[PDB]
Design an enzyme around this catalytic site. Structure first.
Site, PDB file in Angstrom:
ATOM      1  CB  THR A 176       9.657  -1.741  -5.389  1.00 23.33           C
ATOM      2  OG1 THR A 176       9.845  -3.156  -5.288  1.00 23.33           O
ATOM      3  CG2 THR A 176       8.609  -1.303  -4.381  1.00 23.33           C
TER       4      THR A 176
ATOM      5  CG  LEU B 299       4.566  -5.469  -8.680  1.00 26.85           C
ATOM      6  CD1 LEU B 299       3.251  -6.021  -9.178  1.00 26.85           C
ATOM      7  CD2 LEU B 299       4.449  -3.989  -8.395  1.00 26.85           C
ATOM      8  CG  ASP B 300       7.336  -5.596  -3.298  1.00 26.30           C
ATOM      9  OD1 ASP B 300       7.773  -5.095  -4.355  1.00 26.30           O
ATOM     10  OD2 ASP B 300       6.844  -4.915  -2.374  1.00 26.30           O
ATOM     11  CB  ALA B 301       8.698 -12.190  -5.974  1.00 23.93           C
TER      12      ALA B 301
END
Ligand SMILES: [Zn+2]
Lengths: 83, 286, 47, 47, 83, 83, 83, 83, 83, 83, 83, 83, 83
Positions: free
Chosen positions: E23, E59-61
């Protein structure tokens, strides 16, 4: 009991070390582009700084979660109580 | 009951297959369903997929049996918007005259979207409703059909069959075998092209077989992860605490808001990749 | 504990989600559909 | 997990739905859209 | 029993640390281009910010799935129950 | 049998963490290039967004193949039966 | 005590080594962009230096936490007191 | 059998995770250049798309072999038969 | 005590090797940008060299701390005394 | 015997996973540059494709050796017959 | 002394391998920019070469320290003397 | 004896996998610039090919040494006789 | 006796593999820009070539020490004498 605590120490080290590595690389990239923009457009730097801080807020979320969990492991080990 | 038992119950399907004495019976335990061989059926997956497909087809037929060709009503305006969007998506990738591609894309997109949509309803409503209607307290019932790898594999195997069929139909059997043995690595002098047939066969066969697998497993993984996270949040409510059932509500709301977008994206990806894979079954891309 | 508490939590979360979708997602879709209808009507009137 | 005979009924239903959409849904909607486009174009030839 | 607990502490550390690293690097890469675009075209910033948030959603999945599974491993344990 | 369970926990951690890292980095690269393209000419934003979604389907495929298998290892366990 | 004390050295090494690796790479990127900006327009150097220091604070924020934790583990030891 | 089975879960996790990481980074790199190409030459989008999907088959070839052999190890086992 | 010493050897190896790797990559990036800037503006080389020496101080700080800690662990040992 | 077999399985996973990661990243880079070249000069696409395949042979040379040796280690075993 | 001696070989391997990896990547990064600068301005090569050597000394300092420590650990052993 | 033979398969896996990963990434990097140069000046392609092969020899030099040492370890293991 | 030899096999594998990976990536980076410079300035290739060889001499310096030490360990194991 030795194995659980010994592996907890390594877990803490992995958490905060990986967080530090990731944050350093990501902030290097972000700050490098910020410096490039500031050098090319010196009048827009006050806006670029705010946008960079907005991105830095997203960049540090999971790493701060990891740091908090690492401290929780070090001072309040939740694995010793599970036998 | 325990949290582990609660989670383990939500992961089992309503199976109908060959019991030790007779090919008519529902398995009452997970092991009794595993004992049933290949010739068993998930009644809850089929009964939901067929129902949703029939509902979608009936609704779309209601706006096609009376198309006005003038000022459209509310329903057929939506139907025309969907048809126009699908047609534009098809025409930007496929240049042939195939009449099967566009209705297939529309059916795939809308059917998959409807199948994913029922994941938004609370995870305990439909299973408990089925248990109360049937009168049992241990009935297995899973509503979301796309969390079952059988459904996604059945969707992708038919797409693969269509790909192979159209490839043979448009290129001939010789063209089909040539696009597997000669095209990737090719030259002019014969002595080398014979030393490149196994490499070409390996590469093209792997890429050809990897399309249905990827199409099924991407959708399955996304939907299974979404439903698993929905189940895990429901455990926070089971503790009965006050400060834990309030954070769980916020987590559930955020997860549903993200999952509706994920659900739309998955159907869009499946439709676009089906269109792309069928369009490259019709021309020599090399 | 467990059942009858998970149901309440799920119902609360679902009601909040439904309110969110009824107040923020529905109006733009309705507006776009009505715009399509109005443009079609204007074109037909011009014809 | 448990690969079953559900893999076959899903494809059968898939093909049935695709053929019914190809025969009874797509043609009428496409014809209506094209006739409306023709009507609009004809009114643009008033010149 | 102790081996399971130690190897789940290490599993939690891996799940959170790798996600944090990924991340941070991904958001550095995304924010660098966001700042470059904001300096190049200072009038498109409102649209670029919305597009950056749309991409950040992708991105933050898997990172959030891993973080949730790590908390499920710390405060519950599907592995201990398997003996 | 405890070794099998602990190594399955470690395997799940690796399977999810590696996908979380790869997906975050790949989507950072893709989103950065998408933002650059949008900044160059905002007239083509919808087409670029559609192509970005098409590419996002091919980038997260095997990371989602591994997430399903990891969640299948956490609750089911094909290795326990093998003894 | 032997296992815990042995693994604490590995923990400290991971902490400081990962911090050093990340800090060096990030500062390489940041300083390279700083030099590029200073070469493009030589009269902007005094502002670029202050902006680089501001970014460097964020870059080194977490690595300092890692170093502090590593020294705390080296000279004091909570894991030993946890047995 | 316990170690042989327990070390096959790690094998499957590596086979799938390394491939997932590689495909995510590779498809990010490929899609980023595809988007820039589509921006520079908006009339060449379909040719660029078909060429990108030609490249994708080379890109993901070995990863799919790894996924196939990993699935072969999870539900069959050539190693357990060797005692 | 044999395992403690054996693990402090690995700790020293990690502590020096990771710092060396990071320092080499970071200095490669910084030196490449410095060469590009020196080629662009030959008359600003005296200032660019001093500014590069400023960045080199930040790049190597944590690496030097790690090297010092590794030498301390090599010629003395806080872990042998069970701290 | 059992340790040899488990380590052989881990070795096979390591070979195939590392090869897959390498080929995926390399093909991402090569294909991205090929798409850039095709977008710039659409007349040269047929020659660029031939050169790209020439390069791809070198790119995949060693990985094929690795995967062949992994298959040899799975369906035969030169190590079991050496004990 | 069996395990201490065995773990010292891995320490030497880690030191030298990490140093070699970092040095090769860093020198590739530096040499690329040196060649680019020489190609653009062939008259500037004499100055660029001296600047490249100045950078190379800093690049190789810590790697040479690690190599010296590894040779010391190989032809002598400070850990065996600690039992 | 089982430990020595088991640890030799890991050695072969590392020797070949690391070489394959490095070779694939390096050849992607080289072929990308080769394609860019061929697109820029299609009349220099015959010279670019021979220059690329000259570079490729250096790129693949050490990897061939590693792949020869791995096949020397697989057949006629040198470490078995030592013990 | 067995552990020392098994661990020196892994030490040799690390020494060669890390160097091979690093030198492959570094030579890819160097040769890519060498080819770019050759394409941009066709007449300057005989000077860029000798400069590339000068840089390659520095790039491979530590890797040759690593491979020499690895062969010395393989044939003239110095750790078997020290237990
Ligand atoms: Zn072809």
């Amino acid at each position: 009991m030795e194995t659980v605590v010994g592996l907890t120490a390594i877990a803490v080290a992995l958490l905060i070390g990986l967080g530090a590595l990731g944050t350093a690389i990501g902030f290097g990239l972000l700050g490098g582009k910020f410096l490039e923009g500031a050098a090319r457009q010196p009048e827009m730097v006050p806006m670029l700084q705010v946008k960079m801080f907005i991105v830095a807020g997203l960049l540090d979320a999971v790493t701060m979660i990891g740091v908090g969990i690492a401290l929780f492991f070090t001072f309040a080990n939740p694995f010793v109580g599970q036998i | 009951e325990t949290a582990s038992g609660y989670i383990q119950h939500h992961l089992q399907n309503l199976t109908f297959g060959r019991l030790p004495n007779g090919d008519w019976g529902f398995a009452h335990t997970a092991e009794q369903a595993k004992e049933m061989g290949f010739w068993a059926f998930h009644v809850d997956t089929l009964g939901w997929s067929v129902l949703l497909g029939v509902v979608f087809l009936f609704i779309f037929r209601l706006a096609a049996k009376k198309a006005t060709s003038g000022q459209p009503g509310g329903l057929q305006n939506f139907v025309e918007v969907m048809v126009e969007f699908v047609d534009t998506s098809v025409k930007d990738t496929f240049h042939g005259r195939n009449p099967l591609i566009a209705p297939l894309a529309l059916t795939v997109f809308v059917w998959i979207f409807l199948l994913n949509l029922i994941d938004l309803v609370p995870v305990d409503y439909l299973p408990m409703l089925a248990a109360k209607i049937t009168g049992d307290e241990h009935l297995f019932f899973r509503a979301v059909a796309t969390t079952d790898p059988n459904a996604t594999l059945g969707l992708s195997i038919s797409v693969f069959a269509l790909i192979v069929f159209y490839s043979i139909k448009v290129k001939g059997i010789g063209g089909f075998l040539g696009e597997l043995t000669l095209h990737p690595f090719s030259s002019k002098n014969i002595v080398v092209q014979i030393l490149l047939i196994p490499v070409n066969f390996l590469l093209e066969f792997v890429t050809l077989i990897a399309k249905p697998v990827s199409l099924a497993l991407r959708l399955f993984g996304n939907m299974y992860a979404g439903e698993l996270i929905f189940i895990l949040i429901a455990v926070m409510f089971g503790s009965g605490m006050f400060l834990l059932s309030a954070l769980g509500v916020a987590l559930n709301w955020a997860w549903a808001v993200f999952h509706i977008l994920i659900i739309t994206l998955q159907a869009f990806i499946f439709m676009m990749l089906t269109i792309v894979y069928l369009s490259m079954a019709h021309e020599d891309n090399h | 504990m467990n059942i009858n508490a998970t149901l309440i939590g799920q119902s609360v979360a679902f009601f909040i989600f439904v309110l969110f979708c009824m107040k923020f997602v529905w109006p733009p879709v309705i507006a776009a559909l009505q715009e399509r209808q109005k443009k079609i009507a204007d074109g037909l009137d011009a014809a």
